[PDB]
Design a protein around this ligand. Structure first.
Ligand SMILES: *[C@@H]1O[C@H](CO)[C@@H](O[C@@H]2O[C@H](CO)[C@@H](O)[C@H](O)[C@H]2NC(C)=O)[C@H](O)[C@H]1NC(C)=O
Ligand SMILES: *[C@@H]1O[C@H](CO)[C@@H](O[C@@H]2O[C@H](CO)[C@@H](O)[C@H](O)[C@H]2NC(C)=O)[C@H](O)[C@H]1NC(C)=O
Ligand SMILES: *[C@@H]1O[C@H](CO)[C@@H](O[C@@H]2O[C@H](CO)[C@@H](O)[C@H](O)[C@H]2NC(C)=O)[C@H](O)[C@H]1NC(C)=O
Ligand SMILES: *[C@@H]1O[C@H](CO)[C@@H](O)[C@H](O)[C@H]1NC(C)=O
Ligand SMILES: OC[C@@H]1[C@H](O)[C@H](O)[C@]2(O)CC[C@H]1N2
Ligand SMILES: [Ca+2]
Ligand code: NI
Length: 641
């Protein structure tokens, strides 16, 4: 089989870049507290040009205080009249990406919204101008406080759009001088956004990109008819073993070949969240042990580099792309300056399945591929070669240059299965390398945080991964013993993306912990009705946080306590009266060992030898009975795995 690569009959679509998502939700949570140099090395593998994944696009969640898959992410407006552009870690992340690549493209998209935007309903389209005001303030703050230009704004992640909202968002953007910001919709399925654009000229004018999720490499006729740029604005979401690398390799090529999609964006950027949370280890690489510094440059990093190091937003695909006779595919791109990049993939069915969708079997076998360069491409006589074999494996290895000196403008490759080749005229490719990082280590079995940081770099203490509610460093000047605490700051349920719990909760530590003693000072702010807890063996979080079981030691401001097996509190281990009121500091201790637990109030036994389910394992946790203010101090955990 010969394959003509040519440009004399014109180009295909403009290539818009490869990127990844930080957010939906708290996927970068454990990255912020990596020590140096590791934290910076990780960021280089992701964003430094001509090094690792060298990503063209960074998309981040616009935190809305709700649970959005592996945690919550804090909003810039927790309450009406509240504005704070320094919470969370997406600002930091975007700035670190821009430091390494000042041409990186930036995107924001909400998953959840603060509850007050709903005006009494869990719905963000009650007051269109109010919701658009909220979103636009985020884009303004990105520029005013971090010198970040947000390139694209989305609507509501995998949730219904409102056409009047999209029009209001455009009008509000323009009113604030943000004409440069483009709109992508609707970050869900091809429909109903695609037909809506064909039926509504005014909507068509204000939507710049149709972004679909997990499209299985195909699009639909209405989207082609729109004439809009089509993007796989969220894809991948597969474990970053070699099979995830294969999935990513295949769809990177075939999203354009099969579906006219000129950008693909992987969820997620880096797996910096506890692996036992939903969809664990589904990032382009792995960085989930800030305590140890261990990170893994997983195969998808080098699959990315085969495209990103050798294309840039603003190149064009050739019209001459397609599938290989015996399985796999090729794309080809130029920059209009005489450069050419050819990206070939032979991913086998068995080693490249994504979680969404699963493809019916297709065959891949050994084959020869002849490539002939016609048009303006006949005059090139030299190609750098980069090669990857997935499976023991060889990653992003540079082979000896290929020469086309015989004037036939033609060359031939022997392809097997699960291979990637990049043939390019660019000489700038590099398999970036840092020395290996520390070995993997479990979460420390003795761990303490007194939260005594006067000017913290991030708005929350390290390693606490909020799963409902939002927990923050808090300074109380009018108190000496508890001047620096950790406070739960939501006072009403968000407009939720997930099924957030009815109680707030932040989990920490080692999911495999089975015997443990958790201690924490707690402070209930709401008189009469308020309540807090500490917990151990918490076995589920993320979008499953409502499912979490464990051992939960609750105290309440009405003078009572409960011990439950579930966060929902449907299953009782023990309960009784306790000398507990609001607005007083108490020390809670919870001991769990084998079949039995005990609890202490101020170092005095409140209950003991209470039988609990065993075997069982899970994180330690803190939280509050509803969406209510409460403070925590002097946290300690000793645990056995
Ligand atoms: C979108 O991509 C498709 C292919 O995935 C383009 O489709 C036709 O594809 C066949 C074989 O795949 C070619 O023989 C035709 O020449 C293609 N059509 C045209 C008009 O050239 C399709 O053109 C693309 N749509 C765009 C770019 O709007
Ligand atoms: C291939 O791409 C390189 C990188 O853009 C091109 O080189 C640049 O060319 C522009 C003008 O076209 C200069 O202003 C830059 O200083 C060059 N930079 C580098 C790093 O070379 C190159 O012209 C393209 N074409 C070929 C055949 O290499
Ligand atoms: C957690 O504690 C339980 C309860 O003490 C441990 O289980 C006991 O282990 C000893 C020796 O390993 C056995 O002789 C007992 O019969 C076990 N008791 C029960 C009820 O199983 C368990 O090994 C501890 N696990 C860790 C990781 O420390
Ligand atoms: C795949 O194709 C090769 C060559 O045609 C053939 O020998 C092999 O049996 C096929 N495998 C399957 C599972 O169809
Ligand atoms: O595969 C899970 C993905 C991840 O959880 C992202 O948050 C999401 O936007 C919501 C579901 C899907 N896309
Ligand atoms: Ca303190
Ligand atoms: Ni488990």
């Amino acid at each position: 089989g010969a394959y003509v690569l040519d440009d004399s009959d014109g180009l295909g679509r403009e290539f818009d870049g490869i990127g990844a998502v930080s957010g939906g939700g708290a996927t970068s949570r454990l990255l912020v507290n990596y020590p140096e140099p590791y934290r910076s090395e990780i960021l280089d593998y992701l964003f430094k040009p001509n090094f690792g994944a060298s990503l063209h696009i960074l998309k981040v969640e616009i935190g809305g205080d709700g649970q959005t898959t592996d945690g919550t992410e804090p909003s810039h407006m927790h309450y009406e009249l509240d504005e704070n552009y320094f919470r969370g870690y997406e600002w930091w992340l975007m700035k670190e990406a821009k430091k390494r690549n000042p041409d990186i493209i930036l995107m924001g998209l909400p998953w959840s919204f603060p509850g007050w935007l709903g005006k009494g309903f869990s719905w963000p389209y009650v007051n269109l101008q109010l919701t658009a005001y909220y979103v636009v303030r985020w884009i303004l703050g990105a520029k005013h406080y971090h010198d970040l230009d947000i390139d694209y704004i989305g609507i509501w992640n995998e949730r219904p759009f409102d056409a009047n909202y999209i029009k209001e968002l455009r009008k509000m953007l323009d009113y604030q001088g943000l004409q440069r910001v483009r709109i992508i919709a609707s970050d869900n399925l091809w429909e109903p956004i695609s037909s809506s654009l064909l039926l509504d000229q005014e909507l068509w004018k204000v939507v710049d990109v149709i972004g679909a999720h997990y499209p299985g490499t195909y699009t639909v006729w209405n989207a082609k008819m729109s004439g809009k740029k089509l993007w796989s604005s969220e894809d991948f979401s597969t474990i970053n073993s070699n099979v995830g690398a294969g999935c990513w390799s295949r769809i990177l090529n075939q999203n354009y070949i099969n579906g006219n999609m000129t950008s693909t964006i992987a969820w997620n950027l880096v797996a910096s969240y506890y692996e036992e949370l939903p969809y664990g280890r589904s990032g382009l690489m792995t960085a989930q042990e800030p305590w140890s510094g261990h990170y893994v440059v997983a195969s998808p990093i080098w699959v990315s580099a085969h495209t990103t190091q050798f294309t840039q937003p603003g190149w064009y695909y050739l019209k001459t792309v397609g599938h290989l006779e015996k399985g796999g595919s090729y794309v080809a791109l130029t920059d209009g300056l005489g450069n050419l990049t050819i990206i070939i993939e032979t991913m086998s069915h068995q080693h490249s399945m994504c979680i969404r969708p699963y493809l019916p079997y297709y065959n891949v076998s050994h084959q020869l591929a002849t490539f002939t360069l016609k048009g303006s491409l006949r005059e090139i006589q030299e190609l750098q070669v980069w090669y990857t074999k997935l499976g023991q494996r060889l990653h992003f290895k540079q082979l000896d240059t290929l020469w086309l000196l015989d004037g036939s403008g033609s060359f031939t490759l022997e392809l097997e299965e699960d291979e990637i080749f990049t043939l390019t005229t660019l000489t700038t490719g590099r398999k970036g390398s840092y020395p290996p990082p520390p070995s993997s280590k479990p979460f420390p079995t003795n761990y303490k945080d007194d939260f005594n940081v006067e000017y913290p770099l991030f708005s929350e203490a390290p390693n606490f991964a909020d799963q409902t509610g939002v927990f923050e460093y808090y300074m109380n000047n009018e108190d000496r013993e508890h001047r620096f605490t950790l406070r739960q700051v939501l006072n009403q349920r968000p407009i939720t993306w997930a099924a957030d719990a009815s109680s707030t909760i932040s989990v920490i530590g080692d999911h495999h912990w089975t015997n443990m003693t958790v201690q924490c000072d707690v402070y209930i702010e709401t008189p009469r009705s308020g309540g807090v807890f500490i917990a151990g063996r918490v076995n589920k979080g993320g979008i499953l946080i409502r499912s979490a079981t464990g051992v939960f030691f609750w105290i309440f401001a009405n003078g009572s306590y409960r011990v439950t097996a579930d966060l929902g509190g449907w299953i009782t281990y023990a309960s009784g009266h306790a000398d507990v009121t609001a607005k007083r500091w108490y020390t809670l201790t919870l001991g769990i060992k084998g079949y039995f637990a005990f609890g202490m109030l101020n170092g005095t036994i409140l209950w003991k030898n209470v039988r609990v389910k065993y075997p069982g394992h899970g994180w330690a946790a803190i939280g509050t009975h509803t969406f209510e203010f409460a403070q925590f101090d002097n946290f300690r955990v000793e645990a056995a795995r």
